[PDB]
């Protein structure tokens, strides 16, 4: 997250760190949202690589023991069947991970609230992106979980020529684009939390930014629209 602030430890308890085994250690690669005690929602592109993955819930600082973490292996990966790694702009950037164990809920570990199917946010709706992704274009990962305020940019504007054009689809949410604040590499798969009727819900799964840079004016961060996939999510959980 470029232009973020450090999140309070208990603000976004559904945020997870998705990590892969690297030598004798583990490396953060993407975010995710805990949606059941044994299911995480993340981006399909986060799990294209043939890596060993684990999920960390209750994580705050990737570089120190927080005394709150639970570490769990990934038992099964279900990528949306229309996902094409060759074509992120086509959409379908979503995957569900079944965890090897059910995690225990507390102030630091909670299920993410999902929107009702089909829900679209009014232009300029208040949202926060969260994650440990790069804090600058071509920078480095955050140590502590970051948040940034990214108001939505509706489809009519986001798909306009000076924004994302045909690249953005109605199955996506755009947010930000102020040139200062944005997602960045390492935030993919994590939540966009948006305030609707007094409650934050996870309306986006972080998917892509411009190849030119993370915080680029009129290139808002683009998210898979969670409310386009409610039936898909329910069907996966029911069949697995």
């Amino acid at each position: 997250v470029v232009g973020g602030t450090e999140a309070q430890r208990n603000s976004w308890p559904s945020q997870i760190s998705l990590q892969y085994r690297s030598g004798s250690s583990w490396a953060h690669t993407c975010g995710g949202t805990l949606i059941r005690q044994n299911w995480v929602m993340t981006a399909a592109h986060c799990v294209d690589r043939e890596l060993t993955f684990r999920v960390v819930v209750g994580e705050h600082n990737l570089n120190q023991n927080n005394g709150t973490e639970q570490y769990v292996g990934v038992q099964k990966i279900v990528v949306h069947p229309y996902w094409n790694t060759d074509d992120v702009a086509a959409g379908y950037d979503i995957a569900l991970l079944r965890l090897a164990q059910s995690v225990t809920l507390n102030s630091y570990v909670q299920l993410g609230v999902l929107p009702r199917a089909g829900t679209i946010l009014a232009n300029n709706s208040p949202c926060y992106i969260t994650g440990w992704g790069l804090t600058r274009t071509n920078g480095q990962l955050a140590q502590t979980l970051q948040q940034a305020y990214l108001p939505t940019v509706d489809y009519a504007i986001c798909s306009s020529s000076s924004y994302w054009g045909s690249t953005v689809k109605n199955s996506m949410v755009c947010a930000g684009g102020d040139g200062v604040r944005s997602g960045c590499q390492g935030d993919s798969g994590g939540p966009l939390h948006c305030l609707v009727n007094g409650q934050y819900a996870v309306h986006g799964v972080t998917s892509f930014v411009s190849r030119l840079g993370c915080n680029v004016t009129r290139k808002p961060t683009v998210f898979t629209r969670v409310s386009a996939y409610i039936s898909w999510i329910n069907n996966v959980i029911a069949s697995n």
Partner: peptide, 4 residues
């Protein structure tokens, strides 16, 4: 994609 951002991703990492």
């Amino acid at each position: 994609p951002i991703d990492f």
